[PDB]
Amino acid sequence: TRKTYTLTDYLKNTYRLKLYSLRWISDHEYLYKQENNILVFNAEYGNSSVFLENSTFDEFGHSINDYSISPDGQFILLEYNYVKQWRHSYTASYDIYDLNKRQLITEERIPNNTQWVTWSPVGHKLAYVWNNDIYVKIEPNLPSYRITWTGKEDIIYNGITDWVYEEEVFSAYSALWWSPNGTFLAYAQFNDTEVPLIEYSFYSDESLQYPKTVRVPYPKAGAVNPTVKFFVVNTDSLSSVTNATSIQITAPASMLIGDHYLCDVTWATQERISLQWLRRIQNYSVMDICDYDESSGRWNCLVARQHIEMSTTGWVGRFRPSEPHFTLDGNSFYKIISNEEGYRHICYFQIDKKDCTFITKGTWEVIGIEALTSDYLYYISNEYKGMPGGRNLYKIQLSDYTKVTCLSCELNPERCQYYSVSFSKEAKYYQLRCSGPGLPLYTLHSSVNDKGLRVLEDNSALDKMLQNVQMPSKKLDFIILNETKFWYQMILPPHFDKSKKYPLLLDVYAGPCSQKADTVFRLNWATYLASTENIIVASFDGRGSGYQGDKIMHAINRRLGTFEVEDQIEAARQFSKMGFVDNKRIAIWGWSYGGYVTSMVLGSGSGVFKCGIAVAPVSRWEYYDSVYTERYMGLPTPEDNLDHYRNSTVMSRAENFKQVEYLLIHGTADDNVHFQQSAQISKALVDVGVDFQAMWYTDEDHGIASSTAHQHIYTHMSHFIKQCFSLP
Amino acid sequence: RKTYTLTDYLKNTYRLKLYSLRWISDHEYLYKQENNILVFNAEYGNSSVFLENSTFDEFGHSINDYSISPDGQFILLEYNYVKQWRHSYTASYDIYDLNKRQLITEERIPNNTQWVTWSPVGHKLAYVWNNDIYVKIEPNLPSYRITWTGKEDIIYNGITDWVYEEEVFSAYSALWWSPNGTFLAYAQFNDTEVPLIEYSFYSDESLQYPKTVRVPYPKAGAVNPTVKFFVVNTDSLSSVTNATSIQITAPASMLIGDHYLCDVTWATQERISLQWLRRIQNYSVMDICDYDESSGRWNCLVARQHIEMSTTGWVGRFRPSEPHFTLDGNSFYKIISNEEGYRHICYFQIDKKDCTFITKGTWEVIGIEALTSDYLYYISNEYKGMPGGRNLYKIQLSDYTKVTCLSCELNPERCQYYSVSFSKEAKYYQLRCSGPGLPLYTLHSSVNDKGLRVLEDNSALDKMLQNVQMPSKKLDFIILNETKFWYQMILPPHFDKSKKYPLLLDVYAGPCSQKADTVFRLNWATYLASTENIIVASFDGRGSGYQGDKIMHAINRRLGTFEVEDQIEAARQFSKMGFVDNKRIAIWGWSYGGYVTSMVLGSGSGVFKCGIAVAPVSRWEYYDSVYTERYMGLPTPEDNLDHYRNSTVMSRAENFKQVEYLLIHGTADDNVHFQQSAQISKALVDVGVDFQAMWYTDEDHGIASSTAHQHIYTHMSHFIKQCFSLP
Ligand SMILES: *[C@@H]1O[C@H](CO)[C@@H](O[C@@H]2O[C@H](CO)[C@@H](O)[C@H](O)[C@H]2NC(C)=O)[C@H](O)[C@H]1NC(C)=O
Ligand SMILES: *[C@@H]1O[C@H](CO)[C@@H](O[C@@H]2O[C@H](CO)[C@@H](O)[C@H](O)[C@H]2NC(C)=O)[C@H](O)[C@H]1NC(C)=O
Ligand SMILES: *[C@@H]1O[C@H](CO)[C@@H](O[C@@H]2O[C@H](CO)[C@@H](O)[C@H](O)[C@H]2NC(C)=O)[C@H](O)[C@H]1NC(C)=O
Ligand SMILES: *[C@@H]1O[C@H](CO)[C@@H](O[C@@H]2O[C@H](CO)[C@@H](O)[C@H](O)[C@H]2NC(C)=O)[C@H](O)[C@H]1NC(C)=O
Ligand SMILES: *[C@@H]1O[C@H](CO)[C@@H](O[C@@H]2O[C@H](CO)[C@@H](O)[C@H](O)[C@H]2NC(C)=O)[C@H](O)[C@H]1NC(C)=O
Ligand SMILES: CS(=O)(=O)n1cc2c(n1)CN([C@H]1CO[C@H](c3cc(F)c(F)cc3F)[C@@H](N)C1)C2
Ligand SMILES: CS(=O)(=O)n1cc2c(n1)CN([C@H]1CO[C@H](c3cc(F)c(F)cc3F)[C@@H](N)C1)C2
Ligand SMILES: *[C@@H]1O[C@H](CO)[C@@H](O)[C@H](O)[C@H]1NC(C)=O
Ligand SMILES: *[C@@H]1O[C@H](CO)[C@@H](O)[C@H](O)[C@H]1NC(C)=O
Ligand SMILES: *[C@@H]1O[C@H](CO)[C@@H](O)[C@H](O)[C@H]1NC(C)=O
Ligand SMILES: *[C@@H]1O[C@H](CO)[C@@H](O)[C@H](O)[C@H]1NC(C)=O
Ligand SMILES: *[C@@H]1O[C@H](CO)[C@@H](O)[C@H](O)[C@H]1NC(C)=O
Ligand SMILES: *[C@@H]1O[C@H](CO)[C@@H](O)[C@H](O)[C@H]1NC(C)=O
Ligand SMILES: *[C@@H]1O[C@H](CO)[C@@H](O)[C@H](O)[C@H]1NC(C)=O
Ligand SMILES: *[C@@H]1O[C@H](CO)[C@@H](O)[C@H](O)[C@H]1NC(C)=O
Ligand code: NA
């Protein structure tokens, strides 16, 4: 009688989740945007004042994309003319507004096409990157000091990452790191001179007569990589008369012997910086701890303060070596590392001692360190109820490691099993964000006695809307394979009847350290397929999946396209044996790494799947970027792992596609998984005489996220699944 | 009896036999029988082995093709064949001395040679390598370099650039030997400021980074290549260190603006004719130039300059027609549009501006095939007033009233579409009948127009087809606005006019096209009619060829209008005939046909349920300058920009919500760029229209590789069958 959650509801965002995105400005206040007005809230009492009125920039003459208030609250950086580049990179125009004199600064403006801008962490200094060079402004109205002069489009990047460092190393375009009080500005320089370019057509508006060719320095597996250098500049001794001196910090000898990466930069104190370097064979990393020397004006990294992190079973870290969390004096730090059982736990290190002490342990993992005080370390883990797909906040007493308190486990155990946290400047307060299994819940807490101060947002408006919809349910459980539990989830249709046989769609990702079985609440395409179309949408975390230790995660080391593909087939075989699944109607789909796995599964000859959809799939590891691919596969050389690079392609399985219905989709402007990857799959299928369905998306990238393309792709895939399952 | 299936079509089960001969003289031809090259005596039919099947067993390479020198002393062997555009390719070549029975190992033709040609007499060679011309007087002797300006993608000497190859010459070659081989004439193209089309080429899966293919290609209204013309005396090569290439400049009427060199024809040993065309292609000038032995220059008397212009459209069918000179080179015959708009043969004196028409009537001359001192032979569609038929005629030069049809009555039931191949001095001729019955190849003597013998009658295929339920073909016309418009229908076997059949409209409809004819075909339509019981129809509406300029020039400056409307009207007319299921009318086309299909599907007519566009044009500004501007003029506000903008597929995207559409394009299409379909898909996505798509990796405009050909027709067959609810 009630309506179902339809494809139009998903595509038009009829049922919206409310958020509570705050920005901490001190240890007791935060900023929050309400009705376009920026308000300041007192954490203790919940009272607010207007920080900046929505009408302030009514005559600005530009649509403001974002804002950034200086740490001292005197200025506001206004971002406009936003032009997206890659996953994290973009260019924009900036204006600075003085909040005390209520005026826009008109002198010495930040230029247009600025690549990155950041306030110092204290006060109101600015550092920005323009034309691949770094500039520093001590005062917003004063002229800029040019820090670097070597910046060259597609070749020398100062203070910004190139394509592969942005995507695969830093998850950011910025390569600038201010010291804690803003004295020093540390930065990396990337050199892409001999990195080969990926080239692809961009069609643009119909008015463009000749297509443009986009050229991006992108190292594919085994190719020449960018090189890196690291520098530190004193921003307190800058001169208008003389050019700035940047002090270089060279990589340790164990890195300089061959290809390597800079993988982490973390300031320890006002005069101490730590850097982590990673070998191109990503199973060996080195942390250097460097001290400023006032007499020489140099940075010295003592060999007695060097820390090695290596792996004998795989690579180092989940995606990269983890960041250290230094104490106030910078003499020691806490870092998540894989223990002797292969589980990621917090280790406590002294800067000048080799052995660290694990402060946590068990067959579960620490996800992240969130805050550190002299008495407590706060962290997120999946310890609770032994559910790897759940997340809770804990605190550990630093004077007694046996004293671990869960801070979020029992707040609302039925509604909330997946949390993230935001602490105030000195951890006096924390905002907890519960993202499932129930509707998201945002709450504010004080650290002294872990008081639950108030509910910030409980999504009660959405809860009221959803009571009139026949919503699907979610089952999270496990199957046992070779004495190991592997978790899965199922999005079950409303009024689920275990005596009936439902078609099943296997939603796959299965990349290394992936997790597709979790307690998160989502309103997505699967919600529609289950609610309206009565399809079970299942996901499974097999070998190679994360947050369950290295025995599972490292099982696919040097062997992508093996165990993680076999385990999805095994999960479907097991689900197909369940009484509520129609074994004549099992489908599989995935995007990105999931598109590769879907294609490898469809080409396996298992006979389990009737049909499948691969969106922007990888097809051959030699076509993907060096940093990600080599982390798991090593090098594609006869002396390393070339035979497995050649055995793990989708193209080699083309003949096995004769038994399935396949839909292959890819954006023509995908800078990440190049269109080439799907162009080679289609050519191999054509060569063996296999019919299949295809769809290209003109000028769409890896996300196929423009409003019209997003609606079109999900509409096209819904027709395909429905046709496959004989659904009118 | 079995039907003609999709696998019969894709696997070439029912093969048409051909009879490809090569005339070597006035009475002998070469023919390949069991990989042996045989020489046949045309008069008696007796043969001998010219070159044994085993001669090149130990060559070390597969021989793609060969060419015998005109004097029969040498054979040019072509291998390492690498295809480029429609006509161009590169190859390696060896020369084999037929007398000495040995391969020439000294001063070999270089690898990556772009073009090679024997002189018309003897055994001189001219070849193009790295965009420069070279001449070898003797096959084993060093070459003489002719040009030093050749430069990849910039300067082309003796070879055409992309647009001249595709749209002007229909050939890669831009070299023309004089009749006895004394002179070598050539064109030089300069693409310096011509913009490049760029597209990815993925190659074998072993290629880690895709290649970017970059080709100088002028799109409509862009900067065009410029051209120069030269003549070199090859007999002076062994006497001078560096023989002068004498330039022949274009006339003043062409030099005032952008222009093209559109025809080169030698008249005598010392007289050459050149045709030039203005960028606005309704004005052409022919210059007739004589060698001046005293100065070593070429002079073109203004008294011998001929103007060909058009007030209703462009000049020529696709370009101005070539002249056929009398032996003394003082007069010539040329096909031109008469006062009534019908293409007929006109006879010109080289220094007189008014010509005399030698043929007339409401039909057209297709081509001049041979000219002797007493007769001119030509092909026309006069017979029975059928524009889709072709026959060979002979006209007495001393009396124009004496016109004999040589082929009309040979087998009128079986043969209504002929082409011909004459021996070197027209002593014999091979007739090639290509429909409506099975192709038939016959040999004839010109002395008495007598049939000598049947060369190939396709009796083996005839025997095979007797066991197959073959479709039939109807060729007829409908009267619209007091004008006859021809159509053809491929009808299912056992066609019953009381039954309602699904109909597929097979469209091309470009300017001067002809899709209704008498040719016998074994193709996709054969399978659709024979196995799936679908009527496959084609219609020749406004803009179609071979029926006069009133029909052909109707779409002048207005592509995407009458030729699109007339296809919609044809489907309504076929529905009126009573044997068509109006709920099951589909449309499909390739190239210009894909543009027309898309325009029809976006018209909002309601006539068509579904349609397939393969490699369509979507916007005339994306297509090349020479072809597009011939019909559309320039895309400027002063000329025809409003119509260029009004005739795109993209502007009709909203109307595609009413149909099922399949869009298909090869990614390495150098001709209709993938861009054209990339813009269609983007416009459909933008208005929220669901449709089907298929790209073909590394396939060009022909989607002709064996595997892609089989894949595309299989994919299209599934789509049409689903549209027509066929199991
Ligand atoms: C960026 O890297 C390139 C090398 O990839 C550097 O160029 C080399 O410079 C040295 C001299 O310092 C020459 O001997 C090499 O031949 C150069 N190689 C090439 C390929 O140019 C370049 O100097 C680096 N730039 C910066 C600013 O670090
Ligand atoms: C930020 O930290 C820096 C580094 O410790 C401070 O700079 C030092 O300040 C002391 C005291 O004035 C001097 O004796 C040192 O010579 C300074 N060192 C350098 C490298 O400049 C700086 O004063 C601090 N700034 C703020 C705002 O607290
Ligand atoms: C880091 O990576 C590779 C993983 O294969 C190890 O490389 C050694 O060299 C080749 C592989 O290229 C093999 O023949 C050796 O047997 C590998 N060594 C071992 C011990 O397996 C390398 O040793 C690994 N490093 C660490 C710290 O485990
Ligand atoms: C091909 O055409 C270009 C012009 O498009 C000619 O290049 C010019 O040559 C003159 C004389 O050397 C220079 O002064 C100009 O600067 C050149 N222009 C450009 C755009 O490069 C070129 O010489 C022509 N080539 C031939 C062989 O005719
Ligand atoms: C091919 O034709 C050319 C051009 O008419 C002939 O060359 C001329 O021959 C006469 C003698 O009959 C000479 O007086 C001229 O000086 C030649 N002209 C040139 C431009 O070379 C040539 O002899 C003919 N070749 C053959 C084999 O008959
Ligand atoms: C927890 S973290 O902040 O250290 N972290 C998480 C991720 C990363 N870092 C890196 N990110 C990866 C996600 O899959 C991406 C990805 C993987 C593919 F196999 C692919 F085909 C396309 C594709 F985009 C990777 N390029 C980056 C996931
Ligand atoms: C009789 S003739 O020898 O003078 N002659 C016939 C043709 C030509 N010359 C030129 N040729 C044309 C065929 O359609 C082609 C063609 C037309 C299109 F509209 C198109 F989208 C793609 C495409 F390849 C033209 N580029 C050339 C057809
Ligand atoms: C909140 O209330 C306190 C006490 O009344 C006051 O001092 C403070 O300024 C208020 N905070 C804000 C952000 O308005
Ligand atoms: C940014 O661009 C605008 C428009 O071109 C220009 O007026 C303005 O001066 C530019 N800003 C800076 C800081 O260069
Ligand atoms: C700073 O360095 C740049 C580049 O080397 C140079 O052009 C400029 O003149 C220098 N300025 C001073 C003050 O030396
Ligand atoms: C054909 O026959 C004639 C007369 O017998 C003979 O001289 C000639 O060599 C033959 N031709 C061929 C090509 O065998
Ligand atoms: C020569 O050609 C082929 C081998 O390529 C062979 O079948 C044939 O029998 C040979 N002999 C003759 C007389 O054709
Ligand atoms: C053509 O290439 C092959 C292989 O590189 C070489 O052996 C041969 O000599 C070349 N031919 C000529 C004429 O240079
Ligand atoms: C031959 O003459 C032409 C025209 O003057 C000249 O461009 C070329 O360089 C010359 N070649 C030589 C001297 O080898
Ligand atoms: C050629 O066409 C243009 C555009 O239609 C026209 O202005 C011009 O008069 C025509 N020229 C001739 C010679 O008819
Ligand atoms: Na409370």
PDB file of C-alpha atoms in Angstrom, chain A residues 196-201 203-211 213 215 218-221 223 620 622-623 649 651 664 675-676 678-680 682-683 685-687 690-699 708-709 712 716 719, chain B residues 195-200 202-210 212 214 217-220 222 619 621-622 648 650 663 674-675 677-679 681-682 684-686 689-698 707-708 711 715 718:
ATOM      1  CA  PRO A 196      55.409   9.253 -20.063  1.00  0.00           C
ATOM      2  CA  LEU A 197      52.153  11.040 -20.886  1.00  0.00           C
ATOM      3  CA  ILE A 198      48.736   9.427 -21.162  1.00  0.00           C
ATOM      4  CA  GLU A 199      46.868  11.152 -24.049  1.00  0.00           C
ATOM      5  CA  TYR A 200      43.116  11.124 -24.681  1.00  0.00           C
ATOM      6  CA  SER A 201      40.526  13.173 -26.591  1.00  0.00           C
ATOM      7  CA  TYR A 203      35.259  16.666 -27.090  1.00  0.00           C
ATOM      8  CA  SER A 204      33.917  19.647 -25.110  1.00  0.00           C
ATOM      9  CA  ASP A 205      30.748  21.568 -26.149  1.00  0.00           C
ATOM     10  CA  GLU A 206      29.295  20.876 -29.593  1.00  0.00           C
ATOM     11  CA  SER A 207      30.685  24.278 -30.679  1.00  0.00           C
ATOM     12  CA  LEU A 208      34.287  22.945 -30.470  1.00  0.00           C
ATOM     13  CA  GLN A 209      35.267  22.075 -34.087  1.00  0.00           C
ATOM     14  CA  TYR A 210      38.434  20.025 -33.356  1.00  0.00           C
ATOM     15  CA  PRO A 211      38.616  17.818 -30.205  1.00  0.00           C
ATOM     16  CA  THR A 213      43.989  16.104 -26.731  1.00  0.00           C
ATOM     17  CA  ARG A 215      48.148  15.050 -22.032  1.00  0.00           C
ATOM     18  CA  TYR A 218      51.121   9.323 -15.733  1.00  0.00           C
ATOM     19  CA  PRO A 219      53.498   6.447 -15.002  1.00  0.00           C
ATOM     20  CA  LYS A 220      51.907   3.069 -15.853  1.00  0.00           C
ATOM     21  CA  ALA A 221      53.302  -0.114 -14.115  1.00  0.00           C
ATOM     22  CA  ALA A 223      57.386   3.031 -16.288  1.00  0.00           C
ATOM     23  CA  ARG A 620      45.425  -5.449 -17.514  1.00  0.00           C
ATOM     24  CA  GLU A 622      50.330  -2.914 -17.026  1.00  0.00           C
ATOM     25  CA  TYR A 623      47.754  -0.176 -17.957  1.00  0.00           C
ATOM     26  CA  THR A 649      44.192  -9.871 -17.690  1.00  0.00           C
ATOM     27  CA  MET A 651      41.384 -10.143 -22.350  1.00  0.00           C
ATOM     28  CA  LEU A 664      30.754  -2.760 -20.402  1.00  0.00           C
ATOM     29  CA  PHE A 675      39.336   4.283 -21.704  1.00  0.00           C
ATOM     30  CA  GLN A 676      42.126   2.068 -23.275  1.00  0.00           C
ATOM     31  CA  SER A 678      37.776  -1.116 -21.807  1.00  0.00           C
ATOM     32  CA  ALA A 679      38.844  -0.567 -25.477  1.00  0.00           C
ATOM     33  CA  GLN A 680      41.114  -3.649 -25.088  1.00  0.00           C
ATOM     34  CA  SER A 682      35.856  -4.930 -26.319  1.00  0.00           C
ATOM     35  CA  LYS A 683      38.527  -5.728 -28.981  1.00  0.00           C
ATOM     36  CA  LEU A 685      35.488  -9.992 -27.202  1.00  0.00           C
ATOM     37  CA  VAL A 686      35.036  -8.918 -30.858  1.00  0.00           C
ATOM     38  CA  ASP A 687      38.087 -11.058 -31.831  1.00  0.00           C
ATOM     39  CA  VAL A 690      31.269 -12.766 -28.282  1.00  0.00           C
ATOM     40  CA  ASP A 691      28.229 -10.438 -28.367  1.00  0.00           C
ATOM     41  CA  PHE A 692      27.960  -7.958 -25.447  1.00  0.00           C
ATOM     42  CA  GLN A 693      26.406  -4.558 -24.581  1.00  0.00           C
ATOM     43  CA  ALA A 694      28.450  -1.351 -24.330  1.00  0.00           C
ATOM     44  CA  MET A 695      28.049   2.290 -23.441  1.00  0.00           C
ATOM     45  CA  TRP A 696      30.650   5.081 -23.580  1.00  0.00           C
ATOM     46  CA  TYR A 697      30.056   8.401 -21.713  1.00  0.00           C
ATOM     47  CA  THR A 698      31.466  11.319 -23.689  1.00  0.00           C
ATOM     48  CA  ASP A 699      33.823  13.510 -21.588  1.00  0.00           C
ATOM     49  CA  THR A 708      22.947  13.970 -16.522  1.00  0.00           C
ATOM     50  CA  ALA A 709      25.541  11.115 -16.954  1.00  0.00           C
ATOM     51  CA  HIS A 712      21.717   8.043 -17.569  1.00  0.00           C
ATOM     52  CA  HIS A 716      20.746   2.132 -18.499  1.00  0.00           C
ATOM     53  CA  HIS A 719      17.088  -1.687 -17.765  1.00  0.00           C
TER      54      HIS A 719
ATOM     55  CA  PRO B 195      44.673  21.860 -38.420  1.00  0.00           C
ATOM     56  CA  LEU B 196      45.151  18.262 -37.209  1.00  0.00           C
ATOM     57  CA  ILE B 197      42.525  15.735 -36.152  1.00  0.00           C
ATOM     58  CA  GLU B 198      43.938  13.734 -33.206  1.00  0.00           C
ATOM     59  CA  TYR B 199      42.613  10.392 -31.925  1.00  0.00           C
ATOM     60  CA  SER B 200      43.908   7.466 -29.857  1.00  0.00           C
ATOM     61  CA  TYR B 202      45.128   1.353 -28.915  1.00  0.00           C
ATOM     62  CA  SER B 203      46.893  -1.286 -31.029  1.00  0.00           C
ATOM     63  CA  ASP B 204      47.711  -4.818 -29.690  1.00  0.00           C
ATOM     64  CA  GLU B 205      47.105  -5.301 -25.950  1.00  0.00           C
ATOM     65  CA  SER B 206      50.962  -5.403 -25.489  1.00  0.00           C
ATOM     66  CA  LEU B 207      51.068  -1.611 -26.197  1.00  0.00           C
ATOM     67  CA  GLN B 208      51.286   0.050 -22.722  1.00  0.00           C
ATOM     68  CA  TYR B 209      50.468   3.677 -23.757  1.00  0.00           C
ATOM     69  CA  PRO B 210      47.956   4.306 -26.603  1.00  0.00           C
ATOM     70  CA  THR B 212      47.884   9.508 -30.683  1.00  0.00           C
ATOM     71  CA  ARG B 214      47.579  13.088 -35.863  1.00  0.00           C
ATOM     72  CA  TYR B 217      42.410  17.409 -41.921  1.00  0.00           C
ATOM     73  CA  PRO B 218      40.565  20.620 -42.768  1.00  0.00           C
ATOM     74  CA  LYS B 219      37.040  20.577 -41.275  1.00  0.00           C
ATOM     75  CA  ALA B 220      34.374  22.841 -42.876  1.00  0.00           C
ATOM     76  CA  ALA B 222      39.116  25.657 -41.825  1.00  0.00           C
ATOM     77  CA  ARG B 619      27.190  18.259 -37.561  1.00  0.00           C
ATOM     78  CA  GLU B 621      31.200  21.693 -39.259  1.00  0.00           C
ATOM     79  CA  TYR B 622      32.857  18.385 -38.115  1.00  0.00           C
ATOM     80  CA  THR B 648      22.717  19.006 -36.722  1.00  0.00           C
ATOM     81  CA  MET B 650      22.201  17.171 -31.678  1.00  0.00           C
ATOM     82  CA  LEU B 663      24.550   4.298 -32.330  1.00  0.00           C
ATOM     83  CA  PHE B 674      34.390   9.394 -33.464  1.00  0.00           C
ATOM     84  CA  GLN B 675      33.774  12.993 -32.204  1.00  0.00           C
ATOM     85  CA  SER B 677      28.931  10.182 -32.447  1.00  0.00           C
ATOM     86  CA  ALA B 678      30.543  11.332 -29.139  1.00  0.00           C
ATOM     87  CA  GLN B 679      28.529  14.543 -29.616  1.00  0.00           C
ATOM     88  CA  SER B 681      25.605  10.539 -27.275  1.00  0.00           C
ATOM     89  CA  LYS B 682      26.390  13.568 -25.082  1.00  0.00           C
ATOM     90  CA  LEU B 684      21.072  12.312 -25.758  1.00  0.00           C
ATOM     91  CA  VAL B 685      22.496  11.918 -22.207  1.00  0.00           C
ATOM     92  CA  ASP B 686      21.855  15.679 -21.598  1.00  0.00           C
ATOM     93  CA  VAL B 689      17.199   9.745 -23.611  1.00  0.00           C
ATOM     94  CA  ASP B 690      18.048   6.051 -23.224  1.00  0.00           C
ATOM     95  CA  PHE B 691      19.657   4.437 -26.304  1.00  0.00           C
ATOM     96  CA  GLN B 692      22.020   1.609 -27.241  1.00  0.00           C
ATOM     97  CA  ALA B 693      25.640   2.126 -28.209  1.00  0.00           C
ATOM     98  CA  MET B 694      28.631   0.197 -29.469  1.00  0.00           C
ATOM     99  CA  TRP B 695      32.154   1.458 -30.139  1.00  0.00           C
ATOM    100  CA  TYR B 696      34.570  -0.648 -32.279  1.00  0.00           C
ATOM    101  CA  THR B 697      38.159  -0.403 -30.953  1.00  0.00           C
ATOM    102  CA  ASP B 698      40.667   0.612 -33.658  1.00  0.00           C
ATOM    103  CA  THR B 707      35.985 -10.001 -36.745  1.00  0.00           C
ATOM    104  CA  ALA B 708      34.469  -6.480 -36.405  1.00  0.00           C
ATOM    105  CA  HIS B 711      30.392  -8.611 -34.744  1.00  0.00           C
ATOM    106  CA  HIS B 715      24.818  -6.976 -32.952  1.00  0.00           C
ATOM    107  CA  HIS B 718      19.806  -8.844 -32.505  1.00  0.00           C
TER     108      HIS B 718
END
